[PDB]
Amino acid sequence: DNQCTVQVRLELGHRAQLRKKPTTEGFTHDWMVFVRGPEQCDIQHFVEKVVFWLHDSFPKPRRVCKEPPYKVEESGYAGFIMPIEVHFKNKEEPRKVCFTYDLFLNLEGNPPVNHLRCEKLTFNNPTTEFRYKLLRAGGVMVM
Numbered sequence: 756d757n758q759c760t761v762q763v764r765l766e767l768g769h770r771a772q773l774r775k776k777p778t779t780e781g782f783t784h785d786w787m788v789f790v791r792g793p794e795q796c797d798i799q800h801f802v803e804k805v806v807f808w809l810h811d812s813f814p815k816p817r818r819v820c821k822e823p824p825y826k827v828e829e830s831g832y833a834g835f836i837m838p839i840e841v842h843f844k845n846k847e848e849p850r851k852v853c854f855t856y857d858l859f860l861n862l863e864g865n866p867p868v869n870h871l872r873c874e875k876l877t878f879n880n881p882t883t884e885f886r887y888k889l890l891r892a893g894g895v896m897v898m
């Protein structure tokens with residue numbers, strides 16, 4: 756008599772623009788990648804940390820945000836595939852979800868890049884504890 760499914764939403768995104776002039780290092784672009792909730796949700800209730808796995812070419816390429824904003828700001832010269840791990844305040848499975856984020860840059864004279872990726876997470880029969888956190892964050896029951 757106690758089955759329940761709770762949906763929460765995540766937004767992954769990034770912005771990238773051509774620097775007026777390259778940096779010293781010949782970095783041509785500024786970019787920013789993030790994880791956030793939709794308007795008026797606090798994903799920090801169920802998200803323990805977000806880990807952004809930058810290209811090997813970056814120093815300390817494992818970037819952790821343990822609280823909002825969940826984001827990395829950098830300059831560089833090339834797009835790459837970025838693993839993003841979102842770790843949950845969950846005692847049981849699933850403990851985290853792993854995205855493969857396409858961090859692409861604007862070439863030539865293309866406008867700046869401003870992309871959003873909307874992810875719907877479905878938790879089947881979460882524990883009492885974690886269920887609270889999902890709801891506190893503005894998660895929704897699906898019966």
Ligand SMILES: O=C(NCc1ccc(CN2CCCC2)cc1)N1CCN(C(=O)c2cccs2)CC1
Nearest residue numbers: 780782810811812813814830831832833834835
């Ligand atoms: O833009 C960068 N690298 C991105 C990259 C490099 C090479 C490749 C290989 N791609 C294969 C197809 C074309 C390029 C992917 C991504 N970085 C890495 C180098 N870099 C830096 O060394 C630093 C920044 C701040 C402190 S040190 C920052 C800029």
